[PDB]
Amino acid sequence: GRKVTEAPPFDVNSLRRDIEEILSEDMSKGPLFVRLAWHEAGSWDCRKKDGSPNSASMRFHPECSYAGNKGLDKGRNALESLKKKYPKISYADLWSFAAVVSIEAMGGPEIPWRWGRVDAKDGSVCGPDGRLPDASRMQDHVRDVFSRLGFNDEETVALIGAHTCGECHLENTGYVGPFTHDKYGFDNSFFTELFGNEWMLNPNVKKMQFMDKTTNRLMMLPADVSILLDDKYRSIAKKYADDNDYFCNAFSKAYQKLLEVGTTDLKSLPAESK
Ligand code: HEM
Ligand code: NA
Ligand code: NA
């Protein structure tokens, strides 16, 4: 084990500023980068110890063409110019970093980030499909997926609270709309809106989704509203709705863990780079 501290081969403080500038020109890329890094880690099986998480294996087939990753080409493409500018960064480090920077940019927690991920060089390391969650399914499927990733219920609910930011796109997943009225803010408001609305069927979307009664401008997936139906998940979501600092600190710990599954030999930044 034992902590290793070392300056990375790239200029992390300049890289962070370049990412922030991308976000200031196009805030929609912030939630996109958070989803990108999550899908790159979401292939993990903590039992089989496979799926090539945190390795930018999503840059290869078949993983890049799995339905759960549709739209993430826009995320990969959006970082190619920073890859060229900082050529000593791995794609895996760049994706994960861009996600932690995005979260901090949207007013979210400052999430500790370590470097050293090594990029997949071919498709042979890609694990199979059906590792990413199915939005059309409910709480048992959610628990099955998050237990396979190595998370408990408190970490599962906190991670799903990332839908505080961003929105669904019909062209990517057949789902449409934001989860909150502040989609470029990172806070507990996915839980506030979840408890604070009556969810009804949206009759105008072919894939089954909900809308809020009050405005019809929010949406929830079946997997999202399954947090209300599971007694255990509901109790945990209420704690997060009630206490944004507790939600932010739970999300920070769980998202760092996510961006580190199936990794070795990671390095802490020198206090001044972090
Ligand atoms: C039950 C588990 C989850 C399911 C079923 C799920 C499903 C989805 C779907 C279907 C979208 C819409 C994607 C699109 O059309 O562009 C989405 C967006 C998003 N998801 Fe998830 N998700 C889950 C968990 C998570 C986790 C764990 C995170 C991160 C820790 C995450 C973060 C995001 C973000 C940030 C967006 C917005 C992307 C953007 O605005 O481009 N999700 N999710
Ligand atoms: Na992967
Ligand atoms: Na929000």
Author numbering: 55 to 328
Paper text:
On the proximal side there is a typical peroxidase His217-Asp278-Trp233 proximal triad, as observed in yeast CcP and in soybean APX (sAPX, His163-Asp208-Trp179). Electron paramagnetic resonance (EPR) was used to assess whether TcAPx-CcP uses the corresponding Trp233 radical. EPR spectra taken at 4 K for TcAPx-CcP on reaction with H2O2 are consistent with the formation of a [Fe(IV)=O Trp•+] radical in compound I, with a concomitant reduction of the high spin iron heme, g = 6, signal. The radical was centered at g = 2 and showed a pronounced broad linewidth only present at the lowest temperatures with a narrower radical signal observed at 70 K (Fig. 3B(i)). Similar EPR spectra were reported for the exchange coupled porphyrin-tryptophanyl radical in LmP. This broadening was clearly absent in parallel experiments at 4 K on the W233F variant. There are two molecules in the asymmetric unit for both the wild type and mutant structures, each one exhibiting different electron density at the distal heme position, with one appearing to bind an oxygen molecule and another a water molecule approximately 2.3 Å above the iron (not shown). The low temperature EPR spectra support the formation of a reactive compound I intermediate with an exchange-coupled [Fe(IV)=O Trp233•+] radical.
One of these is a hybrid heme peroxidase, the T. cruzi ascorbate peroxidase-cytochrome c peroxidase enzyme (TcAPx-CcP). TcAPx-CcP has high sequence identity to members of the class I peroxidase family, notably ascorbate peroxidase (APX) and cytochrome c peroxidase (CcP), as well as a mitochondrial peroxidase from Leishmania major (LmP). Like LmP, TcAPx was later found to have both ascorbate and cytochrome c activity and was thus renamed as TcAPx-CcP. Integration of steady state kinetic experiments, molecular dynamic simulations, and bioinformatic analyses indicates that TcAPx-CcP preferentially oxidizes cytochrome c but is still competent for oxidization of ascorbate.
